[PDB]
Protein backbone atom coordinates (compact mmCIF):
# COMPACT_ATOMS: atom_id res chain seq x y z
CA UNK A 1 0.00 0.00 0.00
CA UNK A 2 0.94 3.65 -0.51
CA UNK A 3 0.38 5.53 2.77
CA UNK A 4 -0.97 9.06 2.95
CA UNK A 5 1.39 11.37 4.85
CA UNK A 6 -0.57 11.94 8.07
CA UNK A 7 -1.88 8.39 8.28
CA UNK A 8 1.69 7.16 8.15
CA UNK A 9 2.78 9.64 10.83
CA UNK A 10 0.17 8.36 13.26
CA UNK A 11 0.94 4.74 12.38
CA UNK A 12 4.65 5.22 13.17
CA UNK A 13 3.83 7.04 16.40
CA UNK A 14 1.65 4.17 17.59
CA UNK A 15 4.55 1.82 16.81
CA UNK A 16 6.90 3.70 19.12
CA UNK A 17 9.00 5.51 16.54
CA UNK A 18 8.72 9.01 17.94
CA UNK A 19 12.08 9.76 19.50
CA UNK A 20 13.32 6.21 19.11
CA UNK A 21 17.05 6.38 19.93
CA UNK A 22 16.91 10.15 19.55
CA UNK A 23 15.18 10.10 16.13
CA UNK A 24 12.17 12.36 15.74
CA UNK A 25 9.04 11.22 13.92
CA UNK A 26 9.71 13.85 11.22
CA UNK A 27 13.09 12.25 10.45
CA UNK A 28 11.42 8.87 9.99
CA UNK A 29 8.79 10.45 7.73
CA UNK A 30 11.44 12.17 5.60
CA UNK A 31 13.28 8.84 5.34
CA UNK A 32 10.17 6.96 4.22
CA UNK A 33 9.25 9.70 1.73
CA UNK A 34 12.67 9.65 0.02
CA UNK A 35 13.27 5.90 0.22
CA UNK A 36 9.94 4.69 -1.15
CA UNK A 37 7.43 7.49 -1.41
CA UNK A 38 5.55 5.80 1.43
CA UNK A 39 5.11 2.59 -0.61
CA UNK A 40 5.36 -0.67 1.34
CA UNK A 41 5.71 -2.75 -1.80
CA UNK A 42 8.76 -0.81 -3.15
CA UNK A 43 11.73 -2.94 -4.24
CA UNK A 44 15.09 -2.01 -5.72
CA UNK A 45 17.69 -4.41 -7.02
CA UNK A 46 21.31 -3.36 -6.79
CA UNK A 47 23.02 -5.07 -9.70
CA UNK A 48 26.31 -3.87 -8.28
CA UNK A 49 26.37 -6.06 -5.23
CA UNK A 50 23.47 -8.47 -5.77
CA UNK A 51 21.42 -7.16 -2.84
CA UNK A 52 17.89 -5.77 -2.90
CA UNK A 53 16.18 -3.01 -0.91
CA UNK A 54 12.73 -3.86 0.49
CA UNK A 55 9.69 -1.87 1.48
CA UNK A 56 8.82 1.51 2.92
CA UNK A 57 12.24 2.13 4.48
CA UNK A 58 14.14 0.31 1.68
CA UNK A 59 15.98 -2.07 4.01
CA UNK A 60 18.85 -3.93 2.41
CA UNK A 61 19.14 -7.68 2.12
CA UNK A 62 22.90 -7.88 2.76
CA UNK A 63 22.69 -7.01 6.41
CA UNK A 64 19.12 -6.88 7.57
CA UNK A 65 16.71 -9.44 6.16
CA UNK A 66 16.91 -12.80 4.41
CA UNK A 67 15.92 -13.26 0.75
CA UNK A 68 18.05 -16.30 0.13
CA UNK A 69 19.61 -14.82 -2.98
CA UNK A 70 22.13 -12.27 -1.63
CA UNK A 71 25.61 -13.69 -1.31
CA UNK A 72 27.33 -13.65 2.06
CA UNK A 73 24.28 -11.95 3.51
CA UNK A 74 23.30 -11.95 7.17
CA UNK A 75 19.85 -11.36 8.65
CA UNK A 76 20.18 -9.09 11.68
CA UNK A 77 16.45 -8.34 11.92
CA UNK A 78 15.86 -12.08 11.79
CA UNK A 79 13.05 -11.78 9.22
CA UNK A 80 12.36 -12.89 5.68
CA UNK A 81 12.66 -9.89 3.41
CA UNK A 82 9.02 -10.72 2.43
CA UNK A 83 7.97 -9.39 5.86
CA UNK A 84 9.11 -5.95 4.64
CA UNK A 85 6.61 -5.97 1.75
CA UNK A 86 3.45 -6.22 3.89
CA UNK A 87 0.79 -3.53 4.17
CA UNK A 88 1.18 -3.68 7.95
CA UNK A 89 4.48 -2.05 8.75
CA UNK A 90 5.09 -3.46 12.24
CA UNK A 91 7.88 -5.81 11.13
CA UNK A 92 9.47 -3.09 9.00
CA UNK A 93 9.39 -0.77 12.00
CA UNK A 94 11.01 -3.42 14.22
CA UNK A 95 13.72 -3.85 11.61
CA UNK A 96 14.25 -0.11 11.26
CA UNK A 97 14.67 0.14 15.03
CA UNK A 98 17.30 -2.59 14.81
CA UNK A 99 19.19 -0.78 12.04
CA UNK A 100 19.39 2.32 14.24
CA UNK A 101 20.68 0.41 17.26
CA UNK A 102 23.97 0.21 15.39
CA UNK A 103 26.58 2.99 15.66
CA UNK A 104 25.58 5.01 12.55
CA UNK A 105 21.97 5.25 13.62
CA UNK A 106 19.79 6.75 10.95
CA UNK A 107 22.93 7.60 8.96
CA UNK A 108 22.90 3.99 7.63
CA UNK A 109 20.55 5.26 4.91
CA UNK A 110 22.34 7.60 2.47
CA UNK A 111 18.97 9.08 1.38
CA UNK A 112 18.64 10.40 4.88
CA UNK A 113 21.99 12.22 4.65
CA UNK A 114 21.02 13.60 1.20
CA UNK A 115 17.39 14.61 1.78
CA UNK A 116 16.91 14.92 5.56
CA UNK A 117 20.07 15.63 7.52
CA UNK A 118 20.57 19.24 8.48
CA UNK A 119 17.23 20.21 6.94
CA UNK A 120 13.93 21.62 8.07
CA UNK A 121 11.79 18.45 8.14
CA UNK A 122 8.85 19.91 10.05
CA UNK A 123 6.58 19.87 7.02
CA UNK A 124 6.47 16.10 7.11
CA UNK A 125 4.32 15.98 10.29
CA UNK A 126 2.49 19.31 10.00
CA UNK A 127 -1.19 18.88 10.79
CA UNK A 128 -1.06 15.12 11.51
CA UNK A 129 -1.97 15.07 15.20
CA UNK A 130 1.41 13.73 16.30
CL1 LIG B 1 16.23 16.51 14.29
CL1 LIG C 1 9.49 -13.45 8.46
CL1 LIG D 1 -0.44 -6.89 5.17
Domain that holds residue 10: 1-130
Burial class of 41 by CB neighbour count within 10 A (0 to 12, 13 to 18, 19+): middle
CATH number of the domain where residue 52 is located: 1.10.530.10
The count of domains in the chain is 1
Provide CB contacts within 8 A for 104, sequence distance 6+.
none
Ligand nearest to the CA of 1: 3
Nearby residues of 120 by Cβ (< 8 Å), 6 or more positions away: none
- Elucidated via: X-ray
Q: How far is CA 71 from CA 36, 61, 75, 81, in A?
A: 24, 9, 12, 14
How many whole angstroms from 119 Cα to the centroid of ligand 3? 32
Closest ligand by atom to 83 CA: 2
The closest of 117, 61, 121, 56 to 90, measured between CA atoms, is 56
- Residue 26 CA, chain-centre distance (Å), reads 13
Clarify whether 35 is annotated catalytic: yes
Amino acid sequence: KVFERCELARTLKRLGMDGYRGISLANWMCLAKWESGYNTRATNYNAGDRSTDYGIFQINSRYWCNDGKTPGAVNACHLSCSALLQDNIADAVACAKRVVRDPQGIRAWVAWRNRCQNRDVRQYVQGCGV
